[PDB]
A = this chain, B = another copy of it.
């Protein structure tokens, strides 16, 4: 027999992990609410990812760049674990150039302004004295998983390498419920939903986006449910007053009250009388 409104609270455990408490709820509603939130978070949270790459010395994914111990395919797979955050919807190109003996990571890639890389310490490849890596990554927004778009679909050349895209900043979402189940029927379900993201968006913001998406469809479910004064054949003083000052139609006169029209200086008593009788008439 609970009638108070539900409430939301947040508790951060880490920069990525977080724990949101929803309470109170109707008995049995917690499991369904948590499941719906998790299903939306894991699938329909927009993000950004790299879709196509290009190395100068290769033509397809099944070659090998000379001088680097890494293979092209396994370089692609290593690049699969890159997390980013873009602010521009259009495709954006970033560059990675390295030369000499060293371990090239995600910290040697220059992002153009307006986008952010977030895991620069991750390993990409290892070069030698003769090694030389030069790659270009094109990045777009999106949502969910989109497979590699065919090269012939766009006007891409031979060198372009399409790559699978995973726009999903949500990493791991789960939930639990605490049920009181008391004998006075003040029984409620407290939902505890813990969310972890891949360091690309606050789980707070991820749940904000999920909530907006949900309220979209649920609000869809909701919405089911004139004449000129001179034409009145007036006189000298009234005509002069309306001409010099600029009162043209009887609409403004019927909108203006007697106090609002008598404020004018050198106003005539005959003008007051005629305006009163004519507003009484029409």
A contact set with B: CB distance below 8 Å = 1, 5-8, 22, 25-29, 31-33, 35-37, 39-40, 43-44, 142-144, 146, 149-150, 183-185, 204-205, 207-208, 210-212, 214-215, 217-222, 224-225
Contacts and interface: CB of A to CB of B under 8 A. Distances in A.
Tell me which of A5, A142, A149, A222 has the highest count of chain B C-beta atoms within 10 A of its own C-beta.
A222
Contact of A36 (B5, B32, B185, B224): B32
A205 B225 CA distance: 7
B31 A39 contact: yes
How many copies of this chain does the complex contain?
2
B149 A183 contact: yes
Nearest to A219: B215
A183 B221 contact: no
A36 B44 CA distance: 17
- Lowest 4 CB-CB distances: which A-B pairs, in order? A211-B222, A208-B225, A211-B221, A32-B39
A220 B144 contact: no
Contacts of A33: 36, 217
Contacts of A35: 32, 35-36
B221 A214 contact: yes
A215 B210 CA distance: 13
16 contacts: A8-B220, A26-B39, A26-B143, A27-B43, A29-B217, A142-B185, A146-B185, A149-B184, A204-B225, A211-B219, A211-B221, A212-B222, A214-B218, A214-B221, A215-B219, A215-B222
B25 A217 contact: yes
Contacts of A149: 183-185
A205 B143 CA distance: 33
A224 B212 contact: no
Contacts of A5: 220
A204 B223 CA distance: 11
Given A8-B220, A208-B224, A211-B219, 13 more contacts: A1-B142, A7-B220, A8-B221, A25-B217, A26-B143, A27-B43, A29-B43, A142-B185, A149-B185, A208-B222, A214-B218, A215-B218, A215-B222
